[PDB]
Design a protein around this ligand. Sequence first.
Ligand SMILES: CCCCCCCCCCCCCCCCCC(=O)O[C@@H](COC(=O)CCCCCCCCCCCCCCC)COP(=O)(O)OC[C@H](O)CO
Ligand code: HEM
Lengths: 57, 74, 248, 52, 51, 72, 93
Amino acid sequence: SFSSLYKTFFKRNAVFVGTIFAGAFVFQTVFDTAITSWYENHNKGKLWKDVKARIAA
Amino acid sequence: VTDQLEDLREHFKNTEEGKALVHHYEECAERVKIQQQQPGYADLEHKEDCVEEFFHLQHYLDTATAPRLFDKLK
Amino acid sequence: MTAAEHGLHAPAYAWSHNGPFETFDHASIRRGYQVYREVCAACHSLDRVAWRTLVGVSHTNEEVRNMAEEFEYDDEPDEQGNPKKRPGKLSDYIPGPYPNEQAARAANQGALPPDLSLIVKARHGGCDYIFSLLTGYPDEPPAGVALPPGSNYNPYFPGGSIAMARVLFDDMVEYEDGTPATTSQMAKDVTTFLNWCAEPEHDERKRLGLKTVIILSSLYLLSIWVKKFKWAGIKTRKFVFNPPKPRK
Amino acid sequence: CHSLDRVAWRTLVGVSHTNEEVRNMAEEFEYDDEPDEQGNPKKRPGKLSDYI
Amino acid sequence: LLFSVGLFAVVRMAGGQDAKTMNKEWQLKSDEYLKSKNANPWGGYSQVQSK
Amino acid sequence: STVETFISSMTATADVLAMAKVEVNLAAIPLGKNVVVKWQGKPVFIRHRTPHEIQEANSVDMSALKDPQTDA
Amino acid sequence: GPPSGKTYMGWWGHMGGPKQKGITSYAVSPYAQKPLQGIFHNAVFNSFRRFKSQFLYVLIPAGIYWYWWKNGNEYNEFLYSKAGREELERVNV
Ligand SMILES: CCCCCCCCCCCCCCCCCC(=O)O[C@@H](COC(=O)CCCCCCCCCCCCCCC)COP(=O)(O)OC[C@H](O)CO
Ligand code: HEM
């Protein structure tokens, strides 16, 4: 299934470092966002986001 | 109604009284302190007491069952 | 040693802030602040933390500034050098009735009030230790023990006597609900607030720790695979010994 | 008119004034030092550790 | 089995919250109401299920 | 000479060489309570010994003590 | 560069070990293998075999010292319980 389209992508070395670092940055950003979202939605009421509405009349 | 921990203590000691076995130490403390509580000499500082270990074991045993009934309304 | 003053260990209670995937229940810290300030104001100091961490987790924007305006903080003297009085700031520290320490030891009828900013970790046990100390003391000492005149009793606390005035009577808290007037609710509120003051980073610490353990677990498994991979060519090589021909 | 309030007092002994006069007139200036149990400020003239 | 548990987890996550009532405290109140009077069979054992 | 000069530079300076003085009132100390006061880097015990405790202090066998020291 | 001191082991080409002949090795690339071909068999059978082999030298001292510590603990607990006013005075002499 590993066609020439995917085979060609495994030969660049001078430029691959920059794009791999950018991909690592994007992955860490999305991972941080996902973990923050899961920590948010695993606990409701205790957190300070909804106490504003709880005290609201 | 304005009684949560004390009510739990009441119920737990009622369950204990269903098989009451430590208040024999209460009565032995009563007889020790009704018969051996009048030293008129002031050179005594070591009054023997069948209470301290009794109280420690009683509170430990009854409070071992305490951490339950989480009706702490907020 | 002797268990009489060694202190029997309190049982491990169940809290909202003892676990791996938890946060502070800081919907009650807004209530713990009130329960502390209403009764413990002229009793202790707590003067170690500032008000910049009291915004966004217990009060939103305005009541902190109302409290700052409420009290006088002994401003700098004017061009004449005379003393004055000024409203407080939002970056100051929680004040106390005593000037620095003098008015405490004079009125306590005994010892000094320890700084509550660190008492949570100042004793063995932890969150449940203060709960047990403030709950387990009876109103009457054990039979045969005659405490010094003017001193109370507490069996859980090693020492068997403290200068604490047992100000824990209920029925006079009543914020806006039916929650108060029972010892358990205020005890939980005060212990959670004291834990937060001793460590105002629990939520952030646990989030960063979760991210760190996830990334290190991934890296550890990755290193396992790669070590088992590139050592495969050296962990399987076989040796065969053929005796040489007999001629030196 | 000018400060010179940067040195301690133990450096003026045995240089110009011997020991008697500097320490004797070390009781001619109040300093608002430590209070009593009630907290009332107490002014007693300073000692060797006191600066100018 | 791993595919089963993973797909169940992801579909449960995609389902979202669908219960505004019946928390732990609701069950505690119901069990206390049921097991306080009316000839309780040794006080029952109706523990709260889970979160 | 150089080592001695360096050591003397490292050793105690002028201000630490001054000893502090403090006074403690004995009127307010309770009979059955212990008072500890810090003096010049180390604490100092101040305890109101009971009359019974004085007898125990002065009636300690010397043979049980490695260093002979009496209460007086 | 002067030569270093006389040591049994050195650098490549002069290990210092005995000269040997008749030894043949047979390696093969990790690419042409399964990197975890036998992890389960190892971690079960070989782990249990090694545990059984070492099960004759480790637990005995731990058990005897555990008994010593527990006996000391029982003696301490029994001494300061309904015996401190008659038994503890005749042990501190
Ligand atoms: C209930 C606990 C769950 C933990 C989940 C996270 C950890 C998962 C670990 C991998 C899955 C378990 C697989 C079954 C056990 C494998 C143990 C073992 O011996 O396998 C390899 C272990 O792989 C390692 O290299 C492990 C390094 C161990 C480091 C020192 C010991 C620390 C404790 C290890 C176990 C606990 C790890 C997590 C601790 C929190 C082989 O050893 P080796 O690669 O050194 O090769 C030696 C030889 O060829 C034997 O075949
Ligand atoms: C308002 C309610 C109060 C609370 C929640 C409180 C809390 C505490 C706590 C946690 C301790 C230390 C406990 C431990 O050893 O870890 C303590 C000790 C102490 N408190 Fe309070 N306290 C209160 C009221 C008071 C009051 C009214 C006074 C008197 C003015 C006082 C004076 C003291 C003193 C002197 C100590 C130290 C005792 C010692 O050194 O032996 N406290 N308090």
